[PDB]
Design a protein around this ligand. Structure first.
Ligand SMILES: CCOc1ccc2cccc(-n3cc(NC(N)=O)c(C(N)=O)n3)c2c1
Length: 264
């Protein structure tokens, strides 16, 4: 069962503050050290979320951050995850900028790609794949997290394509135009995530407003080649940013292509 009783959790240290509240380093009884995220009431549709728990808790892969269960006895509810010691990918790239070998950066993209190829095979759409949603664990392993979470987020300005805070920077044209989510729209976000990785955590389209990103993309404009991405890597990135989802490679194809580049 996904239900975790409050007595089965101990909060040890405050890791930080997320979007929906607080994040703590804690311990889960007879199991493991965990990351506990407290969710502010009204931030998410808790009822729709718990409905998918039985099926969704079964998803498990070395390249996905495991969400163990939910402590929901009283409000505010808690999400219990595996502990990722180095935090989010975006901050890890930014603070270690200039200390990354190109193979480590490539290796980081490969970790996400394997995670995403597992979700694709399982027919699970992330919807908001970005470096901020990936975590760094022991020995610099990258794991994907927060997949499918935007289907429960209650802020309309983030979820709706015409919303003021819609994450347009990682959106494929069919996503920004119609909210037509697929593993192929995730492939576009993955292409953007690779750019964040090779740029050492720079903000994609930092010099553009939401509407300007939409006009640039529609007119065929793309993110420039990061200094650390080889021409072979930048071509793979561009394949992710193909206007028609059908011309984009699947994560299963990307995994075989990227591994051949890495393995030489
Ligand atoms: C107890 C888990 O319950 C749920 C319920 C609904 C879900 C809907 C979308 C995605 C879910 N989801 C999210 C997960 N992991 C992270 N780090 O986000 C997992 C997992 N199996 O590790 N499942 C869900 C997990």
């Amino acid at each position: 069962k996904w239900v975790i009783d409050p007595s089965e959790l101990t909060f040890v240290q405050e890791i930080g503050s997320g979007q929906f509240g607080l994040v703590h380093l804690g311990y889960w009884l007879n199991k493991d050290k965990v990351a506990i995220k407290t969710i502010r009431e009204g931030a998410m549709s808790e009822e729709d979320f718990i409905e998918e728990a039985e099926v969704m808790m079964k998803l498990s892969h070395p390249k996905l951050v495991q969400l163990y269960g939910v402590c929901l006895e009283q409000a505010p509810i808690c999400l219990v995850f595996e502990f990722m010691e180095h935090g989010c990918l975006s901050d890890y790239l930014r603070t270690q900028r200039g200390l990354f070998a190109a193979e480590t950066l490539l290796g980081m993209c490969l970790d996400v790609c394997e995670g995403m190829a597992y979700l694709e095979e399982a027919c699970v759409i992330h919807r908001d794949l970005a470096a901020r949603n990936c975590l760094v664990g022991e020995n610099q392993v990258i794991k994907v997290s927060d997949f499918g979470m935007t289907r429960f987020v209650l802020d309309d300005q983030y979820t709706s394509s015409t919303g003021t805070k819609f994450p347009v920077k990682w959106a494929s044209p069919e996503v920004f135009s119609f909210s037509r989510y697929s593993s192929k729209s995730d492939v576009w976000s993955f292409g953007v995530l690779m750019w964040e990785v090779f740029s050492e955590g720079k903000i994609p389209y930092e010099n553009r407003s939401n509407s300007e990103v939409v006009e640039d993309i529609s007119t065929g404009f793309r993110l420039y080649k990061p200094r650390l991405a080889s021409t072979h890597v930048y071509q793979i990135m561009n394949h992710c940013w193909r206007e028609r989802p059908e011309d984009r490679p699947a994560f299963s194809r990307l995994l075989r292509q990227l591994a051949e580049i890495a393995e030489s």
